[PDB]
Every structure is written in structure tokens, then in C-alpha cells.
């Protein structure tokens, strides 16, 4: 469980990093932004999921 | 200090508070990159 908890938390930090560089150039650039609307939506959906599944798993570890 | 599971991210926590000042620097980086309008 703790290895799984670290694994999920590490992916969250990574996917936040990938998100924080990713969406500004997703909205901003003018030669594709409208095709990236699904990428940012699924990405943000997975982000809030990953946050809350790591969150509830806290009480099952510590 | 921090629960023992997150203890691995003790360096990550130490580098959090100086992230605010960088925004103000980035705004000057941005302005010089577009050649100051």
C-alpha cells in the first residue's frame, strides 16, 4: 500500500508538472488550441481523480 | 515534522515558499522576450 501510495503521489507531482507547462501553451498558441480542448479536459479530469484517490488512501496508510 | 510517508518529499517542501517571487521575475522575462511594447 505504501509503495502504491508513493507511486500514485509521484505520478501526481509529475502530471501536475506536465499540466503546468502544458495548458498555457494549449490555450495560447494560435495554430492548434481547439484540438487540445479534449486533452486538457481529460487531463484535468484525471488530475482531480488522482488527487482524491491519493487523498483517501492517506488514512489507509498512516 | 511531516507524516512519515511524505518524508521523501522533504526537499520538495523546502523549495515551495520562493515560488511566488518568481512570477514577478517571469513577467520581466516575458516583456524582454517580446522586445518591450
Amino acid at each position: 500500500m505504501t509503495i502504491l501510495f508513493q507511486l500514485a503521489l509521484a505520478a501526481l507531482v509529475i502530471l501536475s508538472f506536465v499540466m503546468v507547462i502544458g495548458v498555457p501553451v494549449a490555450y495560447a498558441s494560435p495554430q492548434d488550441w481547439d484540438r487540445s480542448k479534449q486533452l486538457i479536459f481529460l487531463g484535468s479530469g484525471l488530475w482531480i481523480a488522482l488527487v482524491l484517490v491519493v487523498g483517501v488512501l492517506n488514512f489507509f496508510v498512516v | 515534522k511531516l507524516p512519515e510517508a511524505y518524508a521523501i518529499f522533504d526537499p520538495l517542501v523546502d523549495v515551495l515558499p520562493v515560488i511566488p517571487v518568481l512570477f514577478l521575475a517571469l513577467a520581466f522575462v516575458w516583456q524582454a522576450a517580446v522586445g518591450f511594447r
Binding site: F17, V25, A28, S29 | I19, V29, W30, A33, V34
Partner: peptide, 28 residues
């Protein structure tokens, strides 16, 4: 094992966003 890897990454995180918009020319 290194944790200095993200302190490396997190300082270049800012200008890389602008660098690419200046590669993909538009809206700096």
C-alpha cells in the same frame, strides 16, 4: 537517490513555456 532532480527542473519550468511559444510563433 536524487531529489535534486525536481529542483533542477522547477527553475527552467517558467521560461520553457515562453520559449516554445517563441518557437511556435504566436501570442508572447
Amino acid at each position: 537517490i536524487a531529489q535534486l532532480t525536481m529542483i533542477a527542473m522547477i527553475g527552467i519550468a517558467g521560461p520553457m513555456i515562453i520559449f516554445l511559444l517563441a518557437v511556435r510563433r504566436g501570442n508572447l
